[PDB]
Every structure is written in C-alpha cells, then in structure tokens.
Amino acid sequence: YHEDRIRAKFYSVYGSGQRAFDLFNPNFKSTCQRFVEKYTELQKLGETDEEKLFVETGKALLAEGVILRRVG
Amino acid sequence: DPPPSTLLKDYQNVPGIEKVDDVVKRLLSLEMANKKEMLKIKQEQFMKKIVANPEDTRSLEARIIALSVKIRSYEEHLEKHRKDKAHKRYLLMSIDQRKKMLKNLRNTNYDVFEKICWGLGIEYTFPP
Amino acid sequence: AKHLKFIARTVMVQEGNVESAYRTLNRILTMDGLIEDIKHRRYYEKPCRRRQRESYERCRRIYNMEMARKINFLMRKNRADPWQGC
Amino acid sequence: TKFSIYPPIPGEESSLRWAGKKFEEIPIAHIKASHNNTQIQVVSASNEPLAFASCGTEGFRNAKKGTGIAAQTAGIAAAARAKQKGVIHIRVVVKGLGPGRLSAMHGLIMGGLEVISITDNTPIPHNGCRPRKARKL
Amino acid sequence: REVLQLQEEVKNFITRENLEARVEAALDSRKNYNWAITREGLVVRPQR
Amino acid sequence: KNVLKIRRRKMNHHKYRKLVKKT
Amino acid sequence: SNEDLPISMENPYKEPLKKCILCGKHVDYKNVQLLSQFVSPFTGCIYGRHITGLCGKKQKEITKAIKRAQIMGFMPVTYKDPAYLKDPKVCNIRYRE
Amino acid sequence: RQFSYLIENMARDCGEYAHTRYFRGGMLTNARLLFGPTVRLPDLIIFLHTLNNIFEPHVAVRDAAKMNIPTVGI
Amino acid sequence: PRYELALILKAMQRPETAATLKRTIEALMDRGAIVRDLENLGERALPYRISAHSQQHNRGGYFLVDFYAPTAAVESMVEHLSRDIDVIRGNIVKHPLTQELKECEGIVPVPLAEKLYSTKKR
RNA sequence: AAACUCCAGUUGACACAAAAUAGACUACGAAAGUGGCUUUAACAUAUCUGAACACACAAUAGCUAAGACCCAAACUGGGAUUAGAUACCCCACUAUGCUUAGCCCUAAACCUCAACAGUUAAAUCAACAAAACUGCUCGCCAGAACACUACGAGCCACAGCUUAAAACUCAAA
Ligand SMILES: CN[C@@H]1[C@H](O[C@H]2[C@H](O[C@H]3[C@H](O)[C@@H](O)[C@H](NC(=N)N)[C@@H](O)[C@@H]3NC(=N)N)O[C@@H](C)[C@]2(O)C=O)O[C@@H](CO)[C@H](O)[C@H]1O
Ligand code: FES
Ligand SMILES: [K+]
Ligand SMILES: [Mg+2]
Ligand SMILES: [Mg+2]
Ligand SMILES: [Mg+2]
Ligand SMILES: [Mg+2]
C-alpha cells in the first residue's frame, strides 16, 4: 500500500514504542498509524515533499502529547 | 609503429595539453603504457586512412581493422613464445574470421574490399 | 628453520598441569588440521583419491549441517503432549 | 597479573622466572616420537648435550620400542642423567605423532623434572618431497 | 581534470637535483601502513 | 552396471599383445 | 474502481544488505597488523570464511596479500607476530575452551 | 487433535457422525467386512481439516471419491 | 606504468643507507623511470632469517620507492637489485593505487539449490 | 628377518625437486588441463551450424639426444609368508617422473548425457540415473560373438596408432 513507505520510515527512526498492539481489538489504532493519518492529512494541504511533510507530522503529535523517542 | 612519444588516444583531445611540462607529456605517452595503448592508436590510423566514417566501429570494415591489429599482436607474441599453443590457436582462428569478413565484404561492397586489402596489405585468396 | 623458535605450536603449563596443556595443544592442531594432514602425508595420496575424499567430506558436511539444522528446529516440539486423549 | 598460554617473547621484558632463570635459559627436551622408537635428548640454552635416552638404549627390541611403556622408561633414564647436572625445569619440544609422544612427557616428570611448556615441531611440508606409495595392509 | 591534478604533483616528483635532499628527509620520517579493524568495521589506528 | 563386456575385451587384447611378443 | 487495492511496489520494509567488516576498505600487503588478524597464532594458518566472516572478494584479497607479504619479508609464515597478539579478535574461533 | 473434542460434540449436537481418530484403512473401501453387508455408508463427508498430522491429504478424500461420496472440505 | 619497489636494505648507518638509496634511485632514472616518492617504513626485525650474498641477516630497513617506468625497465632493474650487496630483498609490484576498487552493495544471500532431484517416490 | 652402523639426535649452512592452510571458494581455459610469489605479453568472432582424414592442439605412459637428481619408483636383487608365491608385507636400487630439443597421438580423454535457440503447458514419465519436451543442423548406430582382430592405405610411429570386414558359429546376448 502507499502508507507502507511511511511506516518503514517511522519504525526506522523511532521503532516500535512502549505501547503494545491489541490485535484482538479490530478498531485499534497504533502510534505509527496515527502518524500516517496526520501525514496523509497534511498531504491534502498541498505539501509536495516528503522530508518537510515527515518533519511537520512529528511536531503535531508532540503537540498532542504523543511520545516519540528516537533510537538516539 | 607509432613513436613512443605519441600521446594516448584519450588525452590528445583534451585542450591545453600542447603547452605543459615535458614530464607530464612523457607520462601520458606510449612509453609509460602497455602494449594495448599502442594498438588503440594503430587502429585509429587505419580508420582515418580507410573508412569514410571512423566514428562507426560496428561496421564490417571497422571489425576487419580491429581484428587485423590483434593478428599482428599475436605474431609478435609468437615470435618470442614459439611454444605457446594457446595464442597459436587464437591467431589461426582470427585469420579464419577475417577471411569470412573479406568474403562477405567482397560480396556486398567490392569497392571497400579493394580499399581495405590495399590499406592493410591483405592478399585475398580463394579457398581450395 | 629460519623462523624464531618457541613461538609456534607452543603452550605454557599452568601450575604443573601438563595434561591440560597437551589437550589444549592437541586441540589447536586438530582444529587447524595439522593432525589429519600428517596422517595423510605418511603415504602418498594420488590426486584421484584425494579428490574423491574431498567430495566425500564436502557432501558429508552439507548433509550433517542440514540434519542438525532440522534437529534444532524441531527440538521445540519435544515437549509434552498438550492434547493427551484426543 | 593473569596467566597467558603464549610464551614470553625474549626481547620484551617480563617477570616470569624459574629458579632465577629466564625462559630462554631453560634447558630443552627434544622428543622425537616416531612410530617404532622414541628418542629423547635434553639440551641447554646454548645447545650443549646433557642427556640422551631412547627405547633402544634402555634394552628394548623390535616392536617393544613402539609402546607407551618404553617411552616412559626412556624419560626416566634421561630425567635421571640430567638431574645430576642441575636440571629441574625444561621446555618440551615434541616432534612426531608416535605412541611415545605423551608417555615420554610423563616419564620426564617421574624423574624430578618440571615441564613449563609444550612445543610441537612435527615436520609438515608445504608440498616438498613425495612419500612412499600407499600399502594394501 | 586528471591532467591538472597530475601537473601539480609532478613538481614534488624526485629529480636528480633534489635526489640527495629527499633521501635525507625520508630517513627522518616514517610511514605506517598498519591499522587493525574491529567487529563493527571501525579502523583502529596505531598510537605511535 | 557390470564390466562383463570389458573383461571379454580385456583378455582379447592381452592374448593379442602376448602373441605379437612371441612372433 | 476501488482505491483500497494494493499497488505494485518494491519491498519498502527491506533491510539494507549486510556488509563485511572490510567492505569499502583497501587491503594492502604492507598492513601486517590487519593480515595477522585472520591467521592462527600458533600455526600461522589462514582462517576460512566461516571463521573470519569475510566475503569471497575480500577473503581472497587477504589470502593473496598474506602470501605476498610472507615471501617479500613483511610477514611470518609459521606463526603470528607476537606484537599483534593484543589486537581486537574478529575471528569466530575459541581454542582453550 | 486440538479440535477433536469440539467436532465430536457438535456431531452429537446436530445428530450426525464424526471421525476425528486414526483412520483405519478400509472404513469406506472395505465397510462390508469391517461393519457388515447391510451397512450404509455416509452420503456426505465434511472435511474440516483435509490434511493429516504429517501434512498430507487425508486418505478419506480419495476413499470417498472411489465410493462416489460427495465431500465438503475447508 | 606505476610500480612500487618494496626494498629491504641491510642494517647499516645513515651515511651508507643514503648512499645506497641514491645509487638505487639513479639506476631507475637511467632506465627511464620517473621516481615519485621515497617512503621509509623504518628498521625492524625480519620475520625470518634471510641469507643473501654470503651473509645471514636478522634485521633490515624497509623502504618504498613509488615510480613510473616502461614495461621493459622492470626486468632490467630486477637484475640490478640481485647484484647489490646492500639490498637484502627487493621486489617490484604494480602500485595498488592504480587499481580502482569496485563499489560493493553487500552480501547477497544464496537460497538452497532446488529441483536437484526428481519429485518421485523412491 | 634382512639391511645400515663415517649410523642417530640437537644446532648451523645449503635445490634445475615439489608447491600445507586459504579452498565450507567454485573461477580460468577449446578440451586436455590449471590452486606458491612477482613482472611482461595475453585470452578469436556483432547470426547459428560445420570434418576419424584439412589446419592446430591433446593427461599419464613411452622412444631418441644432452643435462640434473632431494624423494618416490616398473624391472631386478635380497628378506619373509605360503602346499607353491614369478604376488600382496619389509629393504635397496634402476628406467622413468624434472629441464632443453624433437617425436609418439592414446584413456572409463566419462559430467558416458553433441552445437545453437526455446518452453514448463499438454498424454508428466517403461525402469534406473541427473524431470519431461520442441525447433534446427552435423556426426554416428541397426542381434551376439569373431573384432580395440585380418587384409589394404596412410603416418618421424616398425611388438605402434588410425580406419576397419568376412567366413565358420549360436538362438540368444
Ligand atoms: C529357452 N531356451 C534356453 C536356451 O536353450 C538353448 C541352449 O542353446 C545353447 C546352444 O545349444 C549351444 O550350441 C550354444 N553354445 C555355443 N558355444 N554357442 C549355447 O551358447 C546356447 N545357450 C544359450 N545361448 N544360452 O541349449 C539349446 C539346446 C537350447 O535348449 C535350444 O533351444 O538356453 C539355455 C541355457 O544355455 C536355457 O537353459 C534354455 O532355457
Ligand atoms: S561485502 Fe562489500 S566487500 Fe565484502
Ligand atoms: K565418468
Ligand atoms: Mg575372447
Ligand atoms: Mg604451496
Ligand atoms: Mg563452427
Ligand atoms: Mg565424415
């Protein structure tokens, strides 16, 4: 899918976070998926470059309180 | 045999190489190179002398010139290495491959066949 | 002859435990192959026989690696029967 | 410090001493463990023969020399002739994969000698001379 | 580009005039081509 | 596979080479 | 039609191909400190690719360099220079135990 | 084996028959001897697992085709 | 082409070592060489005992001479190094810096061989 | 047992021989074949196919001539075993293996699976082995044995190689 490219980059930069998946719950939204939703939403705005779009998506999650510790 | 001072095929074109040091022109000559750099110049001379368009190297005329330079290379290697059976087969096969090119060139364009035989000194002979 | 002595194939003895030094030295010569090389160099092994032995040793390794790789892969299934009675 | 199995290089200075003598000075016990005999010769650091013993010199004949008891007997005979010249610590240099390869090392210890190192100098060529043809026995 | 780079280097090249001087300079310096590598792929230059 | 066809040729050649050495 | 169908794409989750420790480095015959890392310290025998972990192309560069350094008077043959005994161990081989 | 209990109970619940055990060769192609001449074979076999424990097709798949019994399988 | 002369000189004093290098570098120029540099690897202990010119050497000086010369000058210079009494061992090899290193992308995994035997019930 | 006893062991000096490990790699070359180092020359062909004989190559063994010689080693001699032992086991030594220059032209030279192009569907397919096929071309083969023979021809080959029948005989191989 088109969001697999975004996922591959989110895991590499941050990797699976503390939050654990709940596959039983059909309507479960992971931290990465939430990132993709924001990333996709910002694409509709008109930004045409991944690097700026990716960097801008991270900031929004931080404003909402999401924890995004880098592998650093 | 091009003199050892002759510049390489690649470098000669570059501008500003006419006015440089004598040592820089000696490192770019044929004296500090192998035998395969002198064969690239021999092939260049024949093409200008013979073929109308030297740039095209995939033509039958070009292939004969490129293969005739290898034949001379093998004859110079077999004059010192008489017991080298490997390069004695590469020579005899190359003479048979050139005979097939001269037959196909003599059947299509007899005009260039006379030009190549004169330029390279090949006395075409019919098989027994 | 022309190399320095008492460096190659030399092991020092700890607290007079010669047995451990000899076993270590013999493990260095077997892992490196010297032991088997010296046994095949006593009588000349003709090329054809030496090529038949290398092929036998190479096909034995291939088989032994896969058989071991399957034994380590199926050792997880050596536990007790969970559906005892069905 | 710790204990390494690698011999102390002569040049670089170390602290390992045996009876106040450096590793280089320790005498050497050259063992040639063949298939039908086992010769033992103890030498000093300056290549001076001190003792020589073999299964043949101990009164063994033919196939009794290629046993582990004859090599041990030869070690006791060489560890008793060198102990009278002031030899206690030795460097073992075994040569050969014969039966008396390790049994002679025990015999040297049963004569009052302490082994500080075990060196292997078994002739291995990097293809050189051609061995005799294989046998059908 | 290669010709220009070579033209700069040829100046340093040893010549009969500067042969003796260069020899003395070589006898004062030393070049070490020894460098080890770890399991991570990092070069361990010798501290000399 | 066997060598029952080589053994027939084996003796033929041996007997022929042994006859040429006699004559 | 439908927009949820998958698309033809190369694997994005693919991980970069593994590289040997000497990938991108020049193996010289004068660097005996690097060539002694792949030889046994007791016999001087060259280790294989199942021990060194090197690739085919770099394993033959060490072999060719070791044989050239040995016959030129740069590297020993029957043993490993003691000077390079305290260098990082990169070969997967344990003798003592 | 994991679902052997579940299938047997459902078969009883739905008034039908089950066989989650080792298939003795001949249940179908030799029923006359094993059970009797007047035995009636199944008219429909439902395979919830078409493979055996050695990851190979169940013998009943082929034995039901020889006896022209229609099979259902997951 | 560009070569590299791995030269192992006899352990001598500075005045004698410099006279040998100059005598050796002048022989290359006489054969048509264009010396480029003269690196010193330092004096160390040889890995093994070298016997040259009725002399058993245990130490020597390592010097590298990078140069350019025609193909015919290599064989003539190898006979000049065999007669020099102060040259323990000297070998000429093509400079390793004239050999571009192909870029590598990494190790390619190899899948086990398949379809090696017929799928028949032996 | 014979043999050797100017023998053996340590150390040092010292090859026209042969090339541990790497190589769990799978490369080069037409094949034969090629695995120590360096350097030089250098690895045919922009359709395919194409020869017992043309052209050129071809392991080991072997001939001729001149050198070398560590080791190995047909023959031979000695020792032993054995009913015997022209053998297996032990010892010693030679032709030979090596170099140079010519010749010889063979192999289970067999990956016994021709060269080129292509396919994986259909009847998969006697068996075994290394799954089964298609197109195109060259070469070869038609019961066994006689026969890697005889004759003829050709060949630096003269106890040779290549090519290569028939008669008698069987009802199988
Ligand atoms: C089916 N017949 C088999 C066949 O019998 C054959 C057999 O034929 C034999 C010839 O007479 C003899 O001259 C022939 N002798 C020769 N020197 N050529 C035999 O080789 C031949 N046997 C054979 N080819 N197996 O003997 C004959 C009398 C026979 O009975 C004729 O029918 O061969 C016999 C075995 O030799 C089998 O026992 C028979 O079962
Ligand atoms: S992996 Fe790139 S060189 Fe070894
Ligand atoms: K075969
Ligand atoms: Mg017959
Ligand atoms: Mg070798
Ligand atoms: Mg053809
Ligand atoms: Mg024909």
Ligand SMILES: [Mg+2]
């Ligand atoms: Mg033929």
Ligand SMILES: [Mg+2]
């Ligand atoms: Mg031949």
Ligand SMILES: [Mg+2]
């Ligand atoms: Mg010969």
Ligand SMILES: [Mg+2]
């Ligand atoms: Mg001999």
Ligand SMILES: [Mg+2]
């Ligand atoms: Mg006899």
Ligand SMILES: [Mg+2]
């Ligand atoms: Mg001889």
Ligand SMILES: [Mg+2]
């Ligand atoms: Mg073959």
Ligand SMILES: [Mg+2]
């Ligand atoms: Mg063909």
Ligand SMILES: [Mg+2]
């Ligand atoms: Mg017939």
Ligand SMILES: [Mg+2]
């Ligand atoms: Mg024949």
Ligand SMILES: [Mg+2]
């Ligand atoms: Mg004939």
Ligand SMILES: [Mg+2]
């Ligand atoms: Mg005739």
